[PDB]
Amino acid sequence: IVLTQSPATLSLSPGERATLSCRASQSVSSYLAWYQQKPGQAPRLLIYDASNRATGIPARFSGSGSGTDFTLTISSLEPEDFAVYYCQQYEFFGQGTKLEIKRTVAAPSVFIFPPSDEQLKSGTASVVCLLNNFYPREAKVQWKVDNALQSGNSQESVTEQDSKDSTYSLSSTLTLSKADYEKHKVYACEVTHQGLSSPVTKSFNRGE
């Protein structure tokens, strides 16, 4: 019943050929369709009947396959062709495959922000660690309070791949109470990223 797409995430540079797979658990009709969804927009129809281009679809898009295995192929990746792609047949969708621009590795610019005084007056302390413009997106941020690891008290968010430099940005927030915040001195976030030769640590002391 389920449609399985492969790979989960595909990273290639513009101009190259991308091939997206869509396998069916049961052998089902070759009435498949492929869709393109960009962030914040509705899906757009690309292929129907497994190998027919929809209206207004460039020729670089092409589909094939029947029975239990289906493929979507794009000849030369254009920067406008990088998004999420779902396969669908009747009432069944696939989990999707994200198509991102493969970029030359870039290290993150790491910044840390102590809690503002206004928040401290409200009895809460949020420390923010910023990772600006990096690639790839697989990065590990770990908070260190007095050089001791933190867990369970933070959350992070990552932006969509930038259209200008094809980078990502990560924002991690450690949230403590004013009491627990003032019981410790050194607050740091340790960033690990393949562009960094060694893990980078940005820290601050509660004074100054």
Binding site: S29, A54, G96, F113, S126
Partner: protein
């Protein structure tokens, strides 16, 4: 040219019901099936059901059966999808899609813009804007989505990164909007982040200073 325009976003408590509209134009309304597909934030697409606007007959997905109702009004070319006894995991964007193919399978060539339906037991609340003295702003503890953040009333655009909101354990959302600038203008150029949370008519200008 085909157009599917849906109703604005909605906010509901668990157990309540929501009803989304979808007005069509540019084709014979009674001539094509209308489907309803939803998408939870960050997740994929999920088919809910279709309705034959001519007949009015329906076909609900097995999991939404007994909780969804799809009607239509031919005189105004509008389709409706009502989901009742909502739960938190029903929070999603709800699309209406036209299947334009008589033969073969269901091919959705026209989609609505979507209707965000937020289902949470939390009540609406304006955000608390705290500065991040690279500089930014912390838009903390607000409900529901979304918030729009601009710097200097949109005059400053280069180097701005507004991160996707995170859902905290408290049921309230929170995000951060940072911006990188030359350090020469910090003691001179004034940097203010403008947070606008329409659901609560809350607008905050926060001057960020070292």
């Amino acid at each position: 040219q085909v157009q599917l325009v849906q109703s604005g976003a909605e906010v509901k408590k668990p157990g309540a019901s929501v009803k989304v509209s979808c007005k069509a134009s540019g084709y014979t309304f009674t001539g094509y099936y209308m489907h309803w597909v939803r998408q939870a934030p960050g997740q994929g697409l999920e088919w809910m059901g279709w309705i034959n606007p001519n007949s009015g007959g329906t076909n609900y997905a097995q999991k939404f059966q007994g909780r969804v109702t799809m009607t239509r009004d031919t005189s105004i070319s509008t389709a409706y999808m009502e989901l009742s006894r909502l739960r938190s995991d029903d929070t999603a964007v709800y699309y209406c899609a036209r299947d334009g193919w008589y033969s073969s399978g269901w091919y959705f060539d026209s989609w609505g813009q979507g209707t965000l339906v937020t289902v949470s037991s939390a009540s609406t609340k304006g955000p608390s804007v705290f500065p991040l003295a690279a500089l930014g702003c912390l838009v903390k503890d607000y409900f529901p989505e979304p918030v729009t953040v601009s710097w200097n009333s949109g005059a400053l655009t280069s180097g701005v990164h507004t991160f996707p909101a995170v859902l905290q354990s408290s049921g309230l959302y929170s995000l951060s909007s940072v911006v990188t600038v030359p350090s020469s203008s910090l003691g001179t150029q004034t940097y203010i982040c403008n947070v606008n949370h329409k659901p609560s008519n809350t607008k905050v200008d926060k001057k960020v200073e070292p």
